[PDB]
Every structure is written in structure tokens, then in C-alpha cells.
Design a protein around this ligand. Structure first.
Ligand SMILES: [Cl-]
Ligand SMILES: [Cl-]
Ligand SMILES: [Cl-]
Ligand SMILES: [Cl-]
Ligand SMILES: [Cl-]
Ligand SMILES: [Cl-]
Ligand SMILES: [Cl-]
Ligand SMILES: [Cl-]
Ligand SMILES: [Zn+2]
Ligand SMILES: [Zn+2]
Ligand SMILES: [Zn+2]
Ligand SMILES: [Zn+2]
Ligand SMILES: [Zn+2]
Ligand SMILES: [Zn+2]
Ligand SMILES: [Zn+2]
Ligand SMILES: [Zn+2]
Ligand SMILES: [Zn+2]
Ligand SMILES: [Zn+2]
Ligand SMILES: [Zn+2]
Lengths: 30, 21, 29, 21, 30, 29, 21, 21, 29, 21, 30, 21
């Protein structure tokens, strides 16, 4: 898997792929 | 949070998976 | 019939823009 | 859920906002 | 809605979402 | 039958690349 | 329009160029 | 233009909407 | 029936993330 | 190929990895 | 066509578009 | 390679096409 900085929409896309049917949460202010 | 871990720093696949439900 | 996998990919990008700093949970099922 | 509402029909920005935190 | 810099393809995607059935124009040299 | 909403999202990204500094109008309807 | 031409069939780069300014 | 307003500076949702047809 | 063109666009983005520095060949046909 | 396997059905990360170099 | 730097996923998307049915190869370590 | 040509430097359309199969 890539080893790089993931921000914004690219981070969200990576979560979508990694998490599959489980879904995910994107909380940028945490 | 995810920004500190994965955006300003780098997340391994295992670390990205910590944000899955 | 819409392709759920492709739709969801699109939806999370739209939520990124709409939600901004509030963030969101993506719970497909 | 969001898939049932926003995949079959196009959700406006206002409808998408329901899913935000 | 996000409050951030939007450039290139990310700007175009944001317009696509915001403008809906109305469509939009992307004129970068204006 | 193609999903117009998803198709359009894709098309505008392709026009960004193809049109470059010329830009484009996206008029779906 | 572009939706009628380029959603049902795949438009080449050359066909997409018609829609540029 | 849009680049000056939204790319090198920041556009509010209302400002992005100025570029809709 | 899945839209091959839209599916492929999605797939290559997923391969970018999965493959990382190894890269990949995308051979649809 | 990848289109036959991963367009009709969703490929997991592990299945996608087959296509990497 | 754009004349700009294309990296990562944006580079891959550009190849997908440019190459069509031919496909392409993305070898970042070469 | 492609990174040196198109990411740290700029590729023309003709140069991007060198990476097609
Ligand atoms: Cl995915
Ligand atoms: Cl949407
Ligand atoms: Cl970017
Ligand atoms: Cl949208
Ligand atoms: Cl799609
Ligand atoms: Cl296209
Ligand atoms: Cl996938
Ligand atoms: Cl394309
Ligand atoms: Zn980085
Ligand atoms: Zn996917
Ligand atoms: Zn770093
Ligand atoms: Zn910024
Ligand atoms: Zn980007
Ligand atoms: Zn949308
Ligand atoms: Zn899509
Ligand atoms: Zn700023
Ligand atoms: Zn640049
Ligand atoms: Zn395309
Ligand atoms: Zn430069």
C-alpha cells in the first residue's frame, strides 16, 4: 500500500477503499 | 486525530484501518 | 440500477466537500 | 441510509448535509 | 461547506457538485 | 443505461485535462 | 450535448475537445 | 476569474456558485 | 451490468493506492 | 483480466494486489 | 491538453484518459 | 521514468502517450 501523506479528498478516498463495507469516519478537527 | 496521523504525518495501511467502523 | 460501489466512492468525495471541518461518518450498511 | 437515499436519486447539497457530523 | 483553496481538477469537481443541473463554466485564464 | 450523474462527474475531470488553459462550459441540459 | 454524446459512448480525447472553449 | 478567487484565494460556497450557469 | 469505462477509472485509482511504489500495468483488453 | 474480475464484483485490497507489479 | 505537473493519482488518471483501450503502465520507481 | 518526466518535470500529451501499452 502507498506510504505517503493523504489529505482531504485523497484521504477520504483511501478510507473508502481500505474500509470496504465497514465504512469509516472522517473527523478532521479531532 | 486522522489529520495529525495521516495527513501531516504518514499512516501505514494498519493505521488507516484504525478509522474504519 | 445504480452501482453501489461506484456511487459510494462518489458520495464520500461529495461529503468531504459539503461537510468540511465537521467531518462525517460513512455507514453504507 | 445514505446509499438508499443518495444512490438511487441525486441528493442536493442540503440533503447530503444530513450525513455530516 | 469546506473553506479551502480549490485548484485544477478539485475546483472543477467542486463546481460540478455545487452547480448541479445548471452546469458551470471553468475559465482559468480569466 | 449509463448513470448520468456519475458520468458527468467523470466528464468534467476529463475536460479539465483535455481543455487545459482554454477551459470549458459544462452544460448537461 | 456532451451528456448525450459522451455518456452513452466513450468519447475520444478528440471528441472531448469539441466541448472546450 | 475563478483561479484568483478560489484557487490562490478561498471561495465561500456562495462565491463558487457565481460560476454556475 | 457495470459501466466498464467508469469502473476502469475507479480501478486505476485503487491500484495506485494498493500498489504504491511497485506500480502496475493496466491492461483492460 | 482485471475488468472481468473487478468490475462485475468488488475486489478486496488483496484481490487488487494481484495486478500490481 | 494541460501542460502541468501530474503526480500520483492525478498522473494515473491522466494516463487512463490518454491511453484508452490500450491501457498503460505506471512505474514510479523507474 | 514517468515520475522524473511528468511529475517533477512536465509531460506533453505526446510524452504521456509514451506510457501507454
Ligand atoms: Cl475502493
Ligand atoms: Cl452526490
Ligand atoms: Cl492534490
Ligand atoms: Cl456531485
Ligand atoms: Cl462511476
Ligand atoms: Cl471520458
Ligand atoms: Cl475497487
Ligand atoms: Cl477517461
Ligand atoms: Zn508528501
Ligand atoms: Zn473500489
Ligand atoms: Zn513526510
Ligand atoms: Zn490551502
Ligand atoms: Zn489531488
Ligand atoms: Zn454527486
Ligand atoms: Zn465514478
Ligand atoms: Zn490560504
Ligand atoms: Zn505544478
Ligand atoms: Zn473517460
Ligand atoms: Zn514546473
Amino acid at each position: 500500500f502507498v506510504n505517503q501523506h493523504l489529505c482531504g479528498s485523497h484521504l477520504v478516498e483511501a478510507l473508502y477503499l481500505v474500509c470496504g463495507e465497514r465504512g469509516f469516519f472522517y473527523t478532521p478537527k479531532t | 486525530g486522522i489529520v495529525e496521523q495521516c495527513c501531516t504525518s504518514i499512516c501505514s495501511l494498519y493505521q488507516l484501518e484504525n478509522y474504519c467502523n
